[PDB]
Amino acid sequence: GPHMGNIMSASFAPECTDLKTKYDSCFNEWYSEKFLKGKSVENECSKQWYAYTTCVNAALVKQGIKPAL
Ligand SMILES: [Co+2]
Helix, strand or coil, rough: CCCCCCCHHHHCCCCHHHHHHHHHHEEEEEHHHHHHCCCCCCCCHHHHHHHHHHHHHHHHHHHCCCCCC
């Protein structure tokens, strides 16, 4: 069934939770279309992936646990 989100990650970067939900949903929809239905479709979710990933990276850098440059 559905695999829940990470509580520690959400607690560390709550401002990224909605972006994560949107990315996970996009990816699941894409995977269903291509690998469950076997339909040759465009790659998807690059934008949703970027939004979430950048949000997480920004949080790590802001808290001083990831270098900026
Ligand atoms: Co499952």
